[PDB]
Amino acid sequence: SPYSSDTTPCCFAYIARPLPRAHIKEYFYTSGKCSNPAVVFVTRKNRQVCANPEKKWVREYINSLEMS
Amino acid sequence: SPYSSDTTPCCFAYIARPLPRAHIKEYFYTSGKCSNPAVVFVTRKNRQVCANPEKKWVREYINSLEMS
């Protein structure tokens, strides 16, 4: 992008415990304007969380999110 | 902080036009886990925007936000 005036979702920490996919409205990755590329889950309570794609349940949710 | 698993509001761009303080629920600064320290306004539509403190209306809103 050329220019965007909006806060960027940069995640640096990672959660060890998994989250309730049921309460996980949607998620998304983040990088470029950050220190490292990581994932970000979002529940219905506008709650954002940082998760690494090197986990066993993390990639399980992303794959269970974008199905056919 | 020791460790926090949450996306950080890092702003790098800046808006030239001012915003409607009336629709500006609240704002906050951002830095540390970012490239540069900047301000961030938030309207009732959970809309976040990046604003520099070197403007004429920006510091006007922050000062008009935290009054006595």
Side-chain angles (χ1 to χ4, degrees), chain B residues 18-34:
Chain B
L19 23 164
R21 197 219 168 230
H23 304 220
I24 286 183
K25 211 188 129 77
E26 56 208 350
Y27 75 99
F28 44 76
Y29 292 82
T30 63
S31 204
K33 288 206 224 169
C34 319

PDB file of all heavy atoms in Angstrom, chain B residues 18-34:
ATOM      1  N   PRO B  18      -8.549  16.713  10.205  1.00  0.00           N
ATOM      2  CA  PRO B  18      -8.950  16.465  11.600  1.00  0.00           C
ATOM      3  C   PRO B  18     -10.184  15.559  11.651  1.00  0.00           C
ATOM      4  O   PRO B  18     -10.763  15.224  10.638  1.00  0.00           O
ATOM      5  CB  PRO B  18      -9.277  17.862  12.135  1.00  0.00           C
ATOM      6  CG  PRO B  18      -9.595  18.738  10.898  1.00  0.00           C
ATOM      7  CD  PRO B  18      -8.959  18.034   9.684  1.00  0.00           C
ATOM      8  N   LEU B  19     -10.587  15.160  12.825  1.00  0.00           N
ATOM      9  CA  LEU B  19     -11.781  14.275  12.946  1.00  0.00           C
ATOM     10  C   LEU B  19     -12.830  14.956  13.831  1.00  0.00           C
ATOM     11  O   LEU B  19     -12.543  15.939  14.484  1.00  0.00           O
ATOM     12  CB  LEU B  19     -11.380  12.934  13.573  1.00  0.00           C
ATOM     13  CG  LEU B  19     -10.085  13.093  14.375  1.00  0.00           C
ATOM     14  CD1 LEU B  19      -9.904  11.887  15.298  1.00  0.00           C
ATOM     15  CD2 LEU B  19      -8.898  13.179  13.413  1.00  0.00           C
ATOM     16  N   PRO B  20     -14.019  14.409  13.824  1.00  0.00           N
ATOM     17  CA  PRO B  20     -15.142  14.939  14.618  1.00  0.00           C
ATOM     18  C   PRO B  20     -14.991  14.534  16.087  1.00  0.00           C
ATOM     19  O   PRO B  20     -15.359  13.446  16.481  1.00  0.00           O
ATOM     20  CB  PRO B  20     -16.371  14.279  13.988  1.00  0.00           C
ATOM     21  CG  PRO B  20     -15.862  13.009  13.267  1.00  0.00           C
ATOM     22  CD  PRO B  20     -14.355  13.214  13.023  1.00  0.00           C
ATOM     23  N   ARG B  21     -14.454  15.403  16.899  1.00  0.00           N
ATOM     24  CA  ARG B  21     -14.278  15.069  18.340  1.00  0.00           C
ATOM     25  C   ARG B  21     -15.593  14.527  18.905  1.00  0.00           C
ATOM     26  O   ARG B  21     -15.603  13.693  19.789  1.00  0.00           O
ATOM     27  CB  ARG B  21     -13.876  16.328  19.108  1.00  0.00           C
ATOM     28  CG  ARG B  21     -13.280  15.933  20.462  1.00  0.00           C
ATOM     29  CD  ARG B  21     -13.751  16.917  21.533  1.00  0.00           C
ATOM     30  NE  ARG B  21     -13.418  16.379  22.882  1.00  0.00           N
ATOM     31  CZ  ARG B  21     -14.334  16.326  23.810  1.00  0.00           C
ATOM     32  NH1 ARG B  21     -14.554  17.365  24.569  1.00  0.00           N
ATOM     33  NH2 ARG B  21     -15.032  15.236  23.976  1.00  0.00           N
ATOM     34  N   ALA B  22     -16.704  14.991  18.403  1.00  0.00           N
ATOM     35  CA  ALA B  22     -18.014  14.501  18.914  1.00  0.00           C
ATOM     36  C   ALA B  22     -18.121  12.993  18.683  1.00  0.00           C
ATOM     37  O   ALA B  22     -18.543  12.251  19.548  1.00  0.00           O
ATOM     38  CB  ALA B  22     -19.149  15.212  18.173  1.00  0.00           C
ATOM     39  N   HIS B  23     -17.741  12.533  17.522  1.00  0.00           N
ATOM     40  CA  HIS B  23     -17.822  11.072  17.237  1.00  0.00           C
ATOM     41  C   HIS B  23     -16.534  10.386  17.697  1.00  0.00           C
ATOM     42  O   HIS B  23     -16.346   9.202  17.494  1.00  0.00           O
ATOM     43  CB  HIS B  23     -18.004  10.858  15.733  1.00  0.00           C
ATOM     44  CG  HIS B  23     -19.224  11.601  15.263  1.00  0.00           C
ATOM     45  ND1 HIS B  23     -20.106  11.065  14.339  1.00  0.00           N
ATOM     46  CD2 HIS B  23     -19.719  12.843  15.578  1.00  0.00           C
ATOM     47  CE1 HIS B  23     -21.078  11.972  14.132  1.00  0.00           C
ATOM     48  NE2 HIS B  23     -20.891  13.074  14.864  1.00  0.00           N
ATOM     49  N   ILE B  24     -15.645  11.115  18.316  1.00  0.00           N
ATOM     50  CA  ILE B  24     -14.373  10.497  18.786  1.00  0.00           C
ATOM     51  C   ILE B  24     -14.553   9.976  20.215  1.00  0.00           C
ATOM     52  O   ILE B  24     -14.295  10.673  21.176  1.00  0.00           O
ATOM     53  CB  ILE B  24     -13.254  11.544  18.759  1.00  0.00           C
ATOM     54  CG1 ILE B  24     -12.841  11.809  17.310  1.00  0.00           C
ATOM     55  CG2 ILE B  24     -12.046  11.027  19.543  1.00  0.00           C
ATOM     56  CD1 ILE B  24     -11.676  12.800  17.284  1.00  0.00           C
ATOM     57  N   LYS B  25     -14.994   8.757  20.360  1.00  0.00           N
ATOM     58  CA  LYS B  25     -15.188   8.192  21.725  1.00  0.00           C
ATOM     59  C   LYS B  25     -13.961   8.500  22.585  1.00  0.00           C
ATOM     60  O   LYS B  25     -14.040   9.220  23.561  1.00  0.00           O
ATOM     61  CB  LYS B  25     -15.374   6.677  21.625  1.00  0.00           C
ATOM     62  CG  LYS B  25     -16.284   6.200  22.756  1.00  0.00           C
ATOM     63  CD  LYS B  25     -16.312   4.670  22.780  1.00  0.00           C
ATOM     64  CE  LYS B  25     -16.011   4.176  24.195  1.00  0.00           C
ATOM     65  NZ  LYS B  25     -17.224   4.335  25.047  1.00  0.00           N
ATOM     66  N   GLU B  26     -12.827   7.959  22.231  1.00  0.00           N
ATOM     67  CA  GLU B  26     -11.596   8.220  23.031  1.00  0.00           C
ATOM     68  C   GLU B  26     -10.361   7.938  22.174  1.00  0.00           C
ATOM     69  O   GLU B  26     -10.458   7.407  21.085  1.00  0.00           O
ATOM     70  CB  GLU B  26     -11.584   7.308  24.260  1.00  0.00           C
ATOM     71  CG  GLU B  26     -11.695   5.848  23.815  1.00  0.00           C
ATOM     72  CD  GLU B  26     -12.358   5.025  24.920  1.00  0.00           C
ATOM     73  OE1 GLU B  26     -12.524   5.553  26.006  1.00  0.00           O
ATOM     74  OE2 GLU B  26     -12.691   3.880  24.659  1.00  0.00           O
ATOM     75  N   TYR B  27      -9.200   8.287  22.656  1.00  0.00           N
ATOM     76  CA  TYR B  27      -7.960   8.038  21.867  1.00  0.00           C
ATOM     77  C   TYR B  27      -6.869   7.484  22.787  1.00  0.00           C
ATOM     78  O   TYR B  27      -7.116   7.151  23.930  1.00  0.00           O
ATOM     79  CB  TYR B  27      -7.486   9.351  21.235  1.00  0.00           C
ATOM     80  CG  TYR B  27      -6.846  10.225  22.288  1.00  0.00           C
ATOM     81  CD1 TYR B  27      -5.452  10.269  22.408  1.00  0.00           C
ATOM     82  CD2 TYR B  27      -7.646  10.990  23.145  1.00  0.00           C
ATOM     83  CE1 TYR B  27      -4.858  11.076  23.383  1.00  0.00           C
ATOM     84  CE2 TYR B  27      -7.052  11.798  24.121  1.00  0.00           C
ATOM     85  CZ  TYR B  27      -5.657  11.840  24.242  1.00  0.00           C
ATOM     86  OH  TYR B  27      -5.073  12.637  25.204  1.00  0.00           O
ATOM     87  N   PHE B  28      -5.664   7.386  22.297  1.00  0.00           N
ATOM     88  CA  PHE B  28      -4.556   6.859  23.143  1.00  0.00           C
ATOM     89  C   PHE B  28      -3.251   6.886  22.344  1.00  0.00           C
ATOM     90  O   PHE B  28      -3.255   6.881  21.128  1.00  0.00           O
ATOM     91  CB  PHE B  28      -4.870   5.422  23.563  1.00  0.00           C
ATOM     92  CG  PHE B  28      -5.401   4.652  22.379  1.00  0.00           C
ATOM     93  CD1 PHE B  28      -4.524   4.213  21.378  1.00  0.00           C
ATOM     94  CD2 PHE B  28      -6.770   4.373  22.282  1.00  0.00           C
ATOM     95  CE1 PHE B  28      -5.018   3.497  20.281  1.00  0.00           C
ATOM     96  CE2 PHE B  28      -7.263   3.657  21.184  1.00  0.00           C
ATOM     97  CZ  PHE B  28      -6.387   3.218  20.184  1.00  0.00           C
ATOM     98  N   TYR B  29      -2.133   6.919  23.016  1.00  0.00           N
ATOM     99  CA  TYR B  29      -0.830   6.948  22.294  1.00  0.00           C
ATOM    100  C   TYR B  29      -0.342   5.518  22.058  1.00  0.00           C
ATOM    101  O   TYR B  29      -0.886   4.570  22.591  1.00  0.00           O
ATOM    102  CB  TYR B  29       0.201   7.706  23.133  1.00  0.00           C
ATOM    103  CG  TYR B  29      -0.175   9.167  23.197  1.00  0.00           C
ATOM    104  CD1 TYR B  29      -1.132   9.605  24.121  1.00  0.00           C
ATOM    105  CD2 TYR B  29       0.433  10.084  22.332  1.00  0.00           C
ATOM    106  CE1 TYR B  29      -1.479  10.959  24.182  1.00  0.00           C
ATOM    107  CE2 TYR B  29       0.085  11.440  22.392  1.00  0.00           C
ATOM    108  CZ  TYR B  29      -0.871  11.877  23.317  1.00  0.00           C
ATOM    109  OH  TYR B  29      -1.213  13.213  23.376  1.00  0.00           O
ATOM    110  N   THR B  30       0.680   5.353  21.264  1.00  0.00           N
ATOM    111  CA  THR B  30       1.202   3.983  20.995  1.00  0.00           C
ATOM    112  C   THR B  30       2.704   4.054  20.718  1.00  0.00           C
ATOM    113  O   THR B  30       3.181   4.954  20.054  1.00  0.00           O
ATOM    114  CB  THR B  30       0.486   3.396  19.776  1.00  0.00           C
ATOM    115  OG1 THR B  30       0.774   4.190  18.634  1.00  0.00           O
ATOM    116  CG2 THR B  30      -1.023   3.381  20.023  1.00  0.00           C
ATOM    117  N   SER B  31       3.456   3.113  21.219  1.00  0.00           N
ATOM    118  CA  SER B  31       4.926   3.128  20.982  1.00  0.00           C
ATOM    119  C   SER B  31       5.563   1.908  21.652  1.00  0.00           C
ATOM    120  O   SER B  31       4.886   0.992  22.069  1.00  0.00           O
ATOM    121  CB  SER B  31       5.524   4.404  21.572  1.00  0.00           C
ATOM    122  OG  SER B  31       6.743   4.704  20.903  1.00  0.00           O
ATOM    123  N   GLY B  32       6.865   1.891  21.756  1.00  0.00           N
ATOM    124  CA  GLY B  32       7.546   0.731  22.398  1.00  0.00           C
ATOM    125  C   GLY B  32       7.624  -0.428  21.402  1.00  0.00           C
ATOM    126  O   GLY B  32       8.656  -0.684  20.812  1.00  0.00           O
ATOM    127  N   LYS B  33       6.542  -1.130  21.207  1.00  0.00           N
ATOM    128  CA  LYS B  33       6.555  -2.269  20.249  1.00  0.00           C
ATOM    129  C   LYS B  33       6.198  -1.762  18.850  1.00  0.00           C
ATOM    130  O   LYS B  33       5.512  -2.424  18.095  1.00  0.00           O
ATOM    131  CB  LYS B  33       5.530  -3.317  20.687  1.00  0.00           C
ATOM    132  CG  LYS B  33       6.043  -4.042  21.933  1.00  0.00           C
ATOM    133  CD  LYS B  33       5.427  -5.441  21.998  1.00  0.00           C
ATOM    134  CE  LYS B  33       4.970  -5.732  23.429  1.00  0.00           C
ATOM    135  NZ  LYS B  33       4.144  -6.974  23.443  1.00  0.00           N
ATOM    136  N   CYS B  34       6.654  -0.591  18.500  1.00  0.00           N
ATOM    137  CA  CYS B  34       6.338  -0.041  17.153  1.00  0.00           C
ATOM    138  C   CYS B  34       7.574   0.654  16.579  1.00  0.00           C
ATOM    139  O   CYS B  34       8.635   0.644  17.172  1.00  0.00           O
ATOM    140  CB  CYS B  34       5.195   0.970  17.271  1.00  0.00           C
ATOM    141  SG  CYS B  34       3.947   0.332  18.417  1.00  0.00           S
TER     142      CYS B  34
END
